[PDB]
Design a protein around this nucleic acid. Structure first.
Lengths: 71, 501
RNA sequence: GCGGAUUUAGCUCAGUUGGGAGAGCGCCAGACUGAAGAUCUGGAGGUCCUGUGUUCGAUCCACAGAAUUCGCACCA
């Protein structure tokens, strides 16, 4: 059915953590654990520790996010 | 035929509600004025036409609104306990509001007449004193100056309730369907799941069908014809454990036997509607709105745990604490041991759940050993507060002492004799100021102020330090070249903007 | 500071009969292959560090200067 309480807010990349995970500083406030999407991992796209990215955050868990757009 | 003039002890806290009742109980135990009377779980008897006078030992945290009925109050006459030195307080006017709305004829007991200065106390006599006069009349109420501990003024109080209790409401009624609440959902020795009840008004019959409140919802159960449904405490003669009765009246305590009553809750009505399903959805619906915007922050909530000897008391205090807007966590039945550890598990995060707040329940011997630690408080009357004050002192005690580093201020350092070079791990003595890490290093003012390097890591003996002051003499690691020498005076670069502080 | 070495094509370097300015790589094109790659072939691509002097003539020699690098010397 899928819930529509998902936000598409922007953010800047900070630290380069292992296994395709980043620290991503939001332009709104603090930082989330944000992993790369399954759509972006298949289209490869190498994200550097300082790019502007859009995060797909779920309301159930604030610390977890998801990188949608490339640069 | 004549029943009991139901009376309740209303008023402000610590005004003498419990102590007035302890003296009417002390003269009950004593021979002459009374004698061998029947024991009820919170009630006494009737007028000159039968026993004594029924004082309802008020719901655990001064609730009074539970002692309601079908239409009005379950009480016929009422006795208001006010203090002589305090006068009329905010809970005393709330007591007059519930007294005029239910149309119940009230008597005022002005307690603590032994407390005012230079007053001679004659024990167990009749009194003649005045005080709070602007709130009395024949259309209003009759005031009597009593002392709960000494016993003076009690002779005219029990007489003032008698001149008010001569009514017809002790015979006719009771006709309507039983409205009350249960007491406990326990297991008996001769039967399976049994349920003791407190009935405010109305009559329960031997074949009465009562709707009860479970954990899931509304399920009804017929009162067992096979076996003994209505089980009262057998009169002062030794036979079987309990005894069969037919129809219990208004103000009776009786142990009920029905079918499936296993998951039947604490604080339910004897007409029923309870769920943990709504309270979980009402809490989740307001937490779903608070977590849709909260993809960012923190702060947060409450606690409190209620447990009582009677459910007519649990339901009462729950409704009274929801009036004060203080939310509840647990209203279940058991002691501790396994409850004292779940309390210590939730103290690590937010100390707002640090207390096992008990009431009318007995603390176990195995529990007393886990309460030995101070981190958790134990209450046997019940409240909160001290909780949100413990977590407040936890995060505020670690943010203030963590300030010491940064800001490019003045500092001079001198390199000692015979100390190595490559990535310049040289021994250096501080002259003036505080030499920190990441601070820029320069050459003398005698020559040109050229960039010599920057401090990597400082080491005093064994410890890796961030700030070196006075003349500590440490092992300074710095990115240098031939521009540095041994015995040279180095000054830290104040960037022209940070120079003018 | 002194002393030595080095300074030629974009890079990396050869080049003392004082008289030709050159090689590899690269770059572009061709050939070829389906084509791309490699390979082969062809072309463009120079204040020969700079100035002055010597000579008929100077990358080549002399003198002066600059730059690189190395050793040494100096250092609150």
């Amino acid at each position: 059915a899928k819930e529509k309480d998902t936000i598409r807010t922007e953010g800047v990349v900070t630290e380069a953590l292992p296994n395709a995970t980043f620290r991503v500083k939001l332009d709104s406030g603090p930082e989330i654990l944000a992993y790369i999407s399954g759509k972006m991992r298949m289209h490869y796209i190498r994200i550097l520790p300082g790019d502007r990215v859009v995060v797909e955050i779920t309301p159930y868990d604030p610390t977890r996010g998801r990188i949608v757009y490339r640069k | 035929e004549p029943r009991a003039p139901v009376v309740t002890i209303m008023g402000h806290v610590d005004h003498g509600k419990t102590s007035l009742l302890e003296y009417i109980r002390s003269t009950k135990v004593a021979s002459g004025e009374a004698g061998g009377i029947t024991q009820h779980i919170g009630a006494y008897h009737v007028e000159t036409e039968n026993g004594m006078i029924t004082f309802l030992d008020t719901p655990g945290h001064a609730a009074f609104t539970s002692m309601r009925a079908r239409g009005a109050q379950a009480t016929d006459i009422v006795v208001l306990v006010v203090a002589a030195d305090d006068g009329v307080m905010p809970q005393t006017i709330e007591a007059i509001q519930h007294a005029k709305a239910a149309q119940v004829p009230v008597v005022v007991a002005v307690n603590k007449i032994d407390k005012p200065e230079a007053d001679p106390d004659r024990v167990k006599n009749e009194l003649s004193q005045y005080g709070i006069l602007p709130e009395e009349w024949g259309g209003e109420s009759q005031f009597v100056h009593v002392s709960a501990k000494a016993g003076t003024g009690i002779d005219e109080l029990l007489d003032a309730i008698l001149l008010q209790a001569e009514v017809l409401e002790l015979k006719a009624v009771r006709k309507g369907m039983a409205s009350g609440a249960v007491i406990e959902s326990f297991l008996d020795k001769g039967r399976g799941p049994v349920a003791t009840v407190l009935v405010r008004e109305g009559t329960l019959h031997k074949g009465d069908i009562v709707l009860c409140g479970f954990e899931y919802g509304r399920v009804r159960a017929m009162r067992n014809e096979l076996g003994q449904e209505v089980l009262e405490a057998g009169p002062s003669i030794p036979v079987e454990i309990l005894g069969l009765s037919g129809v219990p009246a208004a103000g009776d305590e009786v142990t009920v036997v029905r079918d499936e009553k296993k998951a039947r809750e604490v604080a339910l009505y004897r007409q029923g509607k309870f769920r943990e399903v709504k309270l979980a959805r009402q809490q989740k619906s307001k937490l779903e709105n608070m977590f849709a915007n909260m993809t960012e922050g923190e702060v947060h909530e409450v606690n409190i745990v209620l447990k009582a000897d009677v459910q007519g008391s649990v339901e009462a205090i729950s409704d009274s604490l929801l009036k004060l807007s203080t939310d509840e966590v647990k209203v279940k039945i058991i002691g501790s041991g396994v409850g004292g550890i779940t309390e210590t598990d939730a103290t690590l995060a937010a100390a707002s759940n640090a207390i096992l707040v008990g009431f009318n329940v007995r603390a176990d011997a195995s529990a007393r050993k886990v309460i030995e630690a101070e981190s958790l408080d134990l209450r046997y009357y019940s409240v909160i507060y001290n909780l949100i004050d413990e977590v407040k002192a936890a995060m505020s005690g670690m943010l203030s002492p963590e300030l010491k580093q940064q800001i490019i201020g003045l500092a001079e350092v001198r390199d000692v004799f015979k100390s190595p070079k490559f990535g310049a791990i040289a021994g250096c003595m501080v002259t003036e100021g505080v030499v920190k890490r990441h601070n820029p290093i320069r050459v003398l003012r005698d020559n040109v102020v050229i960039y010599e390097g920057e401090l990597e890591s400082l080491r005093r003996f064994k410890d890796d330090v961030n700030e070196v002051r006075n003349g500590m003499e440490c092992g300074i690691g710095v990115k240098n070249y031939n521009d540095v020498r041994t015995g040279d005076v180095i000054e830290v670069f104040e960037i022209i903007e940070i120079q003018r502080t």
